[PDB]
Amino acid sequence: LAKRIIACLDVKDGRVVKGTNFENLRDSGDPVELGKFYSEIGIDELVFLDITASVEKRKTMLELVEKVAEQIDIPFTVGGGIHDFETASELILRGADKVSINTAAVENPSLITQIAQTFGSQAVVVAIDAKRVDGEFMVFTYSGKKNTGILLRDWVVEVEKRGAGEILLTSIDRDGTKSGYDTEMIRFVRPLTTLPIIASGGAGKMEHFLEAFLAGADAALAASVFHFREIDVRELKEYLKKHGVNVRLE
């Protein structure tokens, strides 16, 4: 299939955390306007990760989804503290195409199956955060605070067995840096699953996307590089197409 370029928007209280540099926008911190803009310049999908205070989180995330769904015509995933089926269901019904689950899936792997049974595997994105620990790739939960003691290899296989549709693979060893995607980790996971893999963490330049796709990623996610205009989406797709990557220029 064609490779996908995905923009991730960290949101809180209906706003983009740290804002952006797109002066052309009426509101450079409006996640809906920014998402709409991205869909017009070449982004294939969007991911919205919410960190709103628990008391207002449920309603805030639902309002965001409703607005995004009517303004943008590309697929979008919503995530950030989705801990059970009822929360995932409300968000999908309100307009999200997919939900991302991470800590809740590790603690209860049947949650993957519960969501997939009603919404299909394609609606379930399992976000897997991993890091090297004593020579082994380990799965971490609670935003990278807890080493679960579960090997990446075993969790990847279990996630597909439970019915997930896609894996959002973030290397904690590269996330937050601009040194490039963790291609060794992507190549490690590639043969263990038939599911689409979204590479996440470490993007700093267009060549990093080419490397991640050669490593077997089906999609490449980034945030800050796009928001602060370090990388132009249109230029990136042109670059990737130039070098043999099947991206959508349509």
Secondary structure of 136-205 as H, E, C letters? EEEEEECCCCEEEEEEHHHHHHHHHHHCCCEEEEEECCCCCCCCCCCHHHHHHHHHHCCCCEEEECCCCC
Q: Which CATH number belongs to the domain containing residue 96 in this structure?
A: 3.20.20.70
Per the listing, tokens 């043999």 go with 244
Per the listing, tokens 């209280």 go with 13
Asked if residue 97 lies in contact with residue 72, where contact means CB atoms within 8 angstroms, the answer is: no
CA angle 167, 169, 173 (to 5 degrees): 170
**213: containing domain:** 1-250
Asked if residue 238 lies in contact with residue 217, where contact means CB atoms within 8 angstroms, the answer is: no
Whether 84 is catalytic: no
Rounded distance, CA 226 to CA 229, Å? Answer: 5
Residue of 10, 50, 97, 218 marked active site: 10
Find, among 68, 28, 61, the residue nearest to 46 by Cα.
Answer: 68
Rounded distance, CA 137 to CA 134, Å? Answer: 8
3-state secondary structure of 205: coil
The encoded tokens of residue 109 equal: 């792997």
Rounded distance, CA 45 to CA 230, Å? Answer: 19
Asked if residue 229 lies in contact with residue 22, where contact means CB atoms within 8 angstroms, the answer is: yes
Which residues, other chains included, contact 191 with Cβ-Cβ below 8 Å and sequence gap of 6+? none
Task: Tell me which H or E stretch contains 213.
Answer: helix 206-214
Measure Cα distances from 65 to 2, 58, 222 in Å: 26, 11, 20
Residue of 50, 129, 182, 218 marked active site: 129
- Rounded to 10 degrees, what is the CA torsion of 79, 82, 85, 86? -100
Whether 134 is catalytic: no
The encoded tokens of residue 222 equal: 């980034």
Find, among 129, 131, 78, the residue nearest to 106 by Cα.
Answer: 129
Rounded distance, CA 10 to CA 51, Å? Answer: 8
- When divided into structural domains, the chain yields a total of 1
The encoded tokens of residue 86 equal: 């009822």
Find, among 40, 41, 35, the residue nearest to 7 by Cα.
Answer: 35
Task: Give the bridge partners for 99, in sequence order.
Answer: 78, 124
Asked if residue 68 lies in contact with residue 48, where contact means CB atoms within 8 angstroms, the answer is: yes
The CA-to-CA distance between both ends of the chain, in Å, stands at 15
